[PDB]
Design a protein around this ligand. Structure first.
Ligand SMILES: Nc1nc2c(c(=O)[nH]1)N[C@H]1C(S)=C(S)[C@@H](COP(=O)(O)OP(=O)(O)OC[C@H]3O[C@@H](n4cnc5c(=O)[nH]c(N)nc54)[C@H](O)[C@@H]3O)O[C@H]1N2
Ligand SMILES: Nc1nc2c(c(=O)[nH]1)N[C@H]1C(S)=C(S)[C@@H](COP(=O)(O)OP(=O)(O)OC[C@H]3O[C@@H](n4cnc5c(=O)[nH]c(N)nc54)[C@H](O)[C@@H]3O)O[C@H]1N2
Ligand code: SF4
Ligand code: SF4
Ligand code: SF4
Ligand code: SF4
Ligand SMILES: [S]
Ligand SMILES: [W+6]
Lengths: 967, 214
């Protein structure tokens, strides 16, 4: 017997850090009644098989940590000290702050006199770190309170590129999953440092290489990933579109595209209208005065039924694929090599290796995470990857996909639950002012006349109805619809997002901010400006594990508590291993985890905090009345609780959904109270509730499918690692999205050795088929209006084909592909005192702003201080030695760091000038540890991308100078 | 006996192994500074039995040869640390005859610590200044005898860390050396007949660390 574990209860959990979703085993003393005594990997988990990176591996030290919050703290206006206070006080005083601000700022109708039923004087940030049930509850609390300014993590790294995947494939999600990487024949890692940022991914990447795969890293820097790839190709910052356009030209010129796949399953055959043209860097329909396109100029030619016309022969000159060939002929190897700084020889090596996966018996995957995609053409960068994958037949297949790697453990879930301004849960849009009835709301959903187009979003009215019946089960949906707030139809959508929230705060336009599981004082670009702006709040509720740069901005560097009127409530929540719930990983695996030890001290699960905070607002409205009470008073919170506590199990069953009465649906009888077995059996007429249509199937009458720990696989499942009985993935346990594209029109796999699905004996065998229907009777992209993988994507603001427009403003003057230098539908100062391209990135050992990992002594041990990575060339130029202290400055601020001089950074050759990149981690903050240094976001601009509404954290101009020592 | 096969051609320097060793033994963190390197702690100590060493070598063409060395006691088949300590006191250094683990006891406080380190061809032994006890990797011998992999082996995502019976692990090391030489022609095993921690180096072991091999 091991003494350490002898009398400890073993429970399972899921890592609280990155979206790999590694399994943990937790040992809790006194058979569960004590503290954690051990946390390590779960040997039985199919993704990590017991392995953990230093973050997962140090969760014992995060949990059992004497620096954690113990109870609510209170900071009174102008006060220079915290005041320890009760939960009853804190949640009573906050309930009063909410109601006061709401009553004082509720608008029942906008200037145009349209029903909006909203507050604009409260914002909320967070959080991808919360459980799926807590995310869903939290959003519904904020909306019942009438908030519209509801944002989180996803906006920063994911929202800028998600449209690329929705336009191309019909969904925004990672197409495949982590185990599936082992089936790839060629892995292109581009805008990802996965060995550092998704480390257990490399179990599966290196297993692909074991079976013959070529691993390719395309990155401005040589990283821990690069060290373990066959091919490291340097690219200068922002040259990705040229790189990918060259590969498109290469695939097309050499006929390396998979014709039968392209002809049947992409929109290659669709006839684009005569009004479509491209000249001089501009598509047709350009309004030069307003810098925006009339996208109707890009419309397909339609047949008598309104269905886009097709030439299956692919000969018609206005076939998408012939227009694609014409568009990419400019992207020759010499121009691409010159602008990327990649050698022509290395371009041909990579192009040849990757385009070889066009053959049906080979699969290629692209892995990207954030990289540099936050800028206005990031979405076109990902569009190009999606197009390359559709040409090579790599969508829907094992070892294929666009593996858009999620960041936070539950950023997939937190997006799924609608913690962004523009979406309800299930990706049903937040209504605008003109959507004055539920009928009008539902009319906006596009229809198809093509009988082979599943066009599944036509089912939306069932999901909206069932979601209203989950919040308000005694109300008719049409009445419930009026309870939820609306954004102004007239207003630019990005006015409701992350960056405008900061801009408004700094104009004094918010009374209240929830900083719920986020560290905006460190995570937001231009920290000096945001730390000042937080002063202009009246009150701030910060819910986190530790005291931090956000909770305590008022006593941060250069601050004077006396002068700062913001009332701060710090509410300590419990770590992942101290609560029950689910997190949805990057592959959409919704994974149930259990409490090990009880919450530390008086800490609480987010669920209890938010439910108690709301219950107090409710009763405080029931006894004083005030602005529009109906939403608050009628919100169904009964279903969220058991034993006077937030119930993960009951919230998860509501999110799945149940029959509110006896219903016949899809030719089947269902009894009242029964769980909805699948979104296929939801109704629009009030027979069903469901908090989230994507969750219908996750928690059935068979039980909690998220909680399944079953490694049972058929030979064909096991061959590609589907693990269909291990937890559950939306939608309805389809592990590989778009898998109908993996078979021919008879239902036979293109690649039998790596079959995903196969038509045997009148059924689909393997994965769950992504769309019902006999072989050859449906288009394979069932969430697309038209049903095809879009090579030509006319919904995109910048055009239907990716085109190089220079993201790097300051050092670049020439676009070799057109006369259009910058994005024509999107001003940096480029002050010559700041000649260097600053960038920020992660290291394996730290998490996000470091709020969590700067409290972990083993992670501080490995990576104790902010550093500055620079080339030997920039070192030599600035007289900087390895280990020297340096000052990094921008127009926005300045900080000190330890110089790391390394050949892992080389100069970029731009128009015959060496341009120098400077690298910093954004993991450091003034609060901890001693001598750790401060946020790299002191240096970054807020300015923000006109399109994505996200500032620049990957290419911002700095200077670096040696800070002098005593001789 | 038991044996580690450590395939350094698979190592992503994630340092899961370095954290996992401290978590299992509840070892304290050192006070560390950044002095121009990701490496930290910079060395083995009484409270650090494993640290991942980082070395950068130039190569022609883009990138570098980045060399990662997760350093630990080699659990020598004929350990000289024992021979030296046995001069001053038997039972200070012992050998588990089941696993082959070389184990320091509390009686290391009663022998000449500096001599025991000097006798280590790999320069592994470390001395507590207060107690004068010696510490090092102990093979997680308690875990091993209770069916579990050592902490650093279980935690390792890449397949760098491998552990089992010496015959299986030597056969694995030989088979893997043949495959790894295809992409890394200078690949060698470290002292494979003398030690229970058998590293596969992608080039000259000394490039990884001065004491990589005896
Ligand atoms: N260890 C660890 N892992 C994490 C996190 C963490 O803090 N620490 N955070 C998580 C979160 S929330 C997210 S969203 C993800 C982000 O994951 P990643 O996107 O992998 O994160 P970064 O290291 O910021 O950037 C990835 C790489 O992009 C490269 N890059 C920079 N500019 C360009 C460019 O123009 N082109 C190309 N092709 N590459 C470029 C950088 O050199 C870097 O190596 O990581 C997640 N995982
Ligand atoms: N310069 C620069 N800035 C960046 C980035 C970059 O690459 N460079 N990355 C951007 C990206 S991709 C992202 S996602 C953001 C992240 O920015 P933030 O979300 O502000 O980062 P953190 O707060 O450090 O990490 C998430 C938080 O979750 C908290 N948490 C953990 N468990 C729980 C729990 O159970 N409940 C609650 N309520 N909280 C919990 C942690 O303590 C931590 O504070 O930063 C962005 N900012
Ligand atoms: S941080 Fe990511 S890779 Fe590391 S243990 Fe956690 S989930 Fe796994
Ligand atoms: S855990 Fe494995 S991959 Fe990570 S540093 Fe240690 S040996 Fe290398
Ligand atoms: S075998 Fe055990 S004691 Fe030795 S380095 Fe690994 S974790 Fe540490
Ligand atoms: S490596 Fe050194 S300390 Fe470890 S057994 Fe060999 S001689 Fe003893
Ligand atoms: S994220
Ligand atoms: W992120």
């Amino acid at each position: 017997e091991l003494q350490k574990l002898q009398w400890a209860k073993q429970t399972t959990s899921i890592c609280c850090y990155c979206a790999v979703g590694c399994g943990l085993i937790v040992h809790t003393a006194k058979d569960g009644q004590g503290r954690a005594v051990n946390v390590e990997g779960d040997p039985d988990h199919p993704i990590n098989e017991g392995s953990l990176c230093p973050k997962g591996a140090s969760i014992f030290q995060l949990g059992e940590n004497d620096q954690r919050g113990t109870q609510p703290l209170y900071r009174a206006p102008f006060s220079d000290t915290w005041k320890p206070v009760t939960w009853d006080f804190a949640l009573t005083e906050i309930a009063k702050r909410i109601k006061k601000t709401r009553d004082a700022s509720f608008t029942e109708k906008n200037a145009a006199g349209d029903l909006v039923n909203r507050t604009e004087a409260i914002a909320s940030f967070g959080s991808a770190a919360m459980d799926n049930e807590e995310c869903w509850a939290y959003g519904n609390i904020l909306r019942s309170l009438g908030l519209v300014y509801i944002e989180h993590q996803a906006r920063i790294x994911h929202s800028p590129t998600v449209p690329a995947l929705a336009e191309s494939f019909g969904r925004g999600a990672m197409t495949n999953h982590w185990n599936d990487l082992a089936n790839s024949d060629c892995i292109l890692i581009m805008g990802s440092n996965a060995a550092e940022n998704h480390p257990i991914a490399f179990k599966w990447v290196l297993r692909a290489k074991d079976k013959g795969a070529t691993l390719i890293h395309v990155d401005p820097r040589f990283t821990r990933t690069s060290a373990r790839c066959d091919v490291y190709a340097p690219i200068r910052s922002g040259a990705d579109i040229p790189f990918l356009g060259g590969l498109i030209k290469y695939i097309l010129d050499n006929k390396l595209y998979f014709t039968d796949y392209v002809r049947e399953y992409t929109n290659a055959s669709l006839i684009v209208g005569e009004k479509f043209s491209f000249k001089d860097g501009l598509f047709s329909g350009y309004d030069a005065a307003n810098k925006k396109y009339d996208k109707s100029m890009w419309a397909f030619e339609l047949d008598a039924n309104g269905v886009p016309k097709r030439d299956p022969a692919l000969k018609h000159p206005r076939c998408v694929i012939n227009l694609l060939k014409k568009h990419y002929e400019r992207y020759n190897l010499d121009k691409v090599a010159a602008i990327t700084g990649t050698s022509k020889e290395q371009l041909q090596q990579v192009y040849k290796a990757y385009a070889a996966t066009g053959k049906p018996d080979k699969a290629g995957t692209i892995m990207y995470a954030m990289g540099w995609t936050q800028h206005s053409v990031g979405v076109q960068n990902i569009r190009a990857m999606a197009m390359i994958q559709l040409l090579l037949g790599n969508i829907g297949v094992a070892g294929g996909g666009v593996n858009a790697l999620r960041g936070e453990s539950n950023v997939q879930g937190s997006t799924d639950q609608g913690l962004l301004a523009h979406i309800w849960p299930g990706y049903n849009p937040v209504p605008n002012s003109k959507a004055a009835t539920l009928e009008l709301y539902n009319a906006a959903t596009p229809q198809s006349k093509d009988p082979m187009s599943v066009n599944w979003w036509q089912n939306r009215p069932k999901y909206v109805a069932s979601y209203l019946k989950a919040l308000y089960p005694d109300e008719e949906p049409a009445a419930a619809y009026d309870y939820l707030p609306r954004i102004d139809a007239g207003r630019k959508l990005t006015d409701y997002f992350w960056l405008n929230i900061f801009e408004k705060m700094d104009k004094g336009e918010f009374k209240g901010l929830f900083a719920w599981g986020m560290n905006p004082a460190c995570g937001g670009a231009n920290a000096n400006k945001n730390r000042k702006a937080m002063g202009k709040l009246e009150w701030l509720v910060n819910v986190n594990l530790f005291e931090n740069e956000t909770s305590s901005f008022w006593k941060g560097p250069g601050m004077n508590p006396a002068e700062i009127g913001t009332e701060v409530f710090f509410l300590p929540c419990c770590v992942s291993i101290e609560k029950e719930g689910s997190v949805a990983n990057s592959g959409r695996w919704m994974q149930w985890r259990y409490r090990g030890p009880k919450p530390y001290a008086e800490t609480k699960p987010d669920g209890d905090i938010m439910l108690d905070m709301f219950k107090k607002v409710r009763e405080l409205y029931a006894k004083e009345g005030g602005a529009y009470p109906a939403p608050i008073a009628k919100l169904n919170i009964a279903d969220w609780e058991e034993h006077n506590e937030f119930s993960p199990t009951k919230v998860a069953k509501l999110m799945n959904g149940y029959f509110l009465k006896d219903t016949e649906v899809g030719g089947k009888q269902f009894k009242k109270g029964q769980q909805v077995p699948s979104f296929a059996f939801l109704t629009a007429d009030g027979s069903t509730c469901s908090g989230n249509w994507l969750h219908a199937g996750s928690f059935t009458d068979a039980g909690n499918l998220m909680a399944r720990r079953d490694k049972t696989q058929t030979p064909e499942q096991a061959r590609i690692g589907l693990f269909p009985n291990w937890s559950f993935c939306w939608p309805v346990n389809r592990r590989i999205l778009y898998n109908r594209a993996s078979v021919d029109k008879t239902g036979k796999p293109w690649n039998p050795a790596k079959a995903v699905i196969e038509w045997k004996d009148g059924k689909w065998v393997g994965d769950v088929v992504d769309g019902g229907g006999d072989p050859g009777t449906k288009h394979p992209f069932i969430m697309q209006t038209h049903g095809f993988g879009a090579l030509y994507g006319p919904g995109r603001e910048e055009g239907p084909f990716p085109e190089h427009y220079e993201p790097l403003e300051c050092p670049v003057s020439k676009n070799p592909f057109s006369k259009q230098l910058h994005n024509p539908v999107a001003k940096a100062v480029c002050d010559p005192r700041y000649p260097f391209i600053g960038t920020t990135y992660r290291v394996t050992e730290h998490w996000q702003t470091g709020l969590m990992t700067r409290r972990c002594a083993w992670l501080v041990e490995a990576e104790p201080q902010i550093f500055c990575e620079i080339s030997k060339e920039l070192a030599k130029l600035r007289g900087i030695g390895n280990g020297d202290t340096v000052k990094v400055s921008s127009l926005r601020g300045a900080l000190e760091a330890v110089a790391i001089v390394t050949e892992r950074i080389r100069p970029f050759k731009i128009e015959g000038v060496d341009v120098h990149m400077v690298g910093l981690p954004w993991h450091y903050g003034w609060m901890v540890p001693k001598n750790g240094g401060d946020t790299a976001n002191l240096l970054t601009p807020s300015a923000g991308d006109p399109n994505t509404g996200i500032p620049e954290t990957k290419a911002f101009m700095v200077d670096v100078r040696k800070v002098w020592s005593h001789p | 006996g038991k044996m580690f096969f450590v395939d350094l051609s698979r190592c992503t320097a994630c340092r899961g192994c370095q954290i996992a060793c401290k978590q299992w033994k509840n070892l304290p963190a050192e006070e560390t500074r950044n002095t121009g390197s990701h490496q930290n702690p910079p060395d083995l100590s009484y409270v650090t039995l494993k640290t991942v060493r980082f070395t950068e070598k130039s190569r022609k063409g883009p990138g570098i040869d980045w060399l990662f060395f997760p350093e630990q006691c080699r659990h020598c088949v004929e350990p000289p640390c024992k021979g030296q300590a046995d001069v001053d006191l038997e039972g200070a250094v012992v050998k588990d005859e089941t696993t082959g683990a070389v184990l320091f006891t509390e009686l290391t406080a009663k022998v000449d610590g500096e001599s025991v380190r000097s006798a280590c061809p790999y320069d592994i032994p470390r001395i507590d200044p207060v107690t004068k006890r010696l510490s090092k990797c102990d093979m997680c011998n308690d875990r091993v005898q209770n069916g579990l992999l050592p902490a650093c082996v279980k935690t390792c995502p890449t397949g760098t860390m491998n552990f089992g019976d010496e015959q299986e692990m030597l056969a694995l090391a030989e088979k893997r050396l043949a495959e790894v030489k295809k992409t890394y022609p200078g690949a060698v095993l470290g002292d494979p007949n003398d030690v229970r921690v058998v590293y596969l180096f992608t080039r000259d072991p000394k490039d990884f660390y001065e004491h990589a091999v005896a």
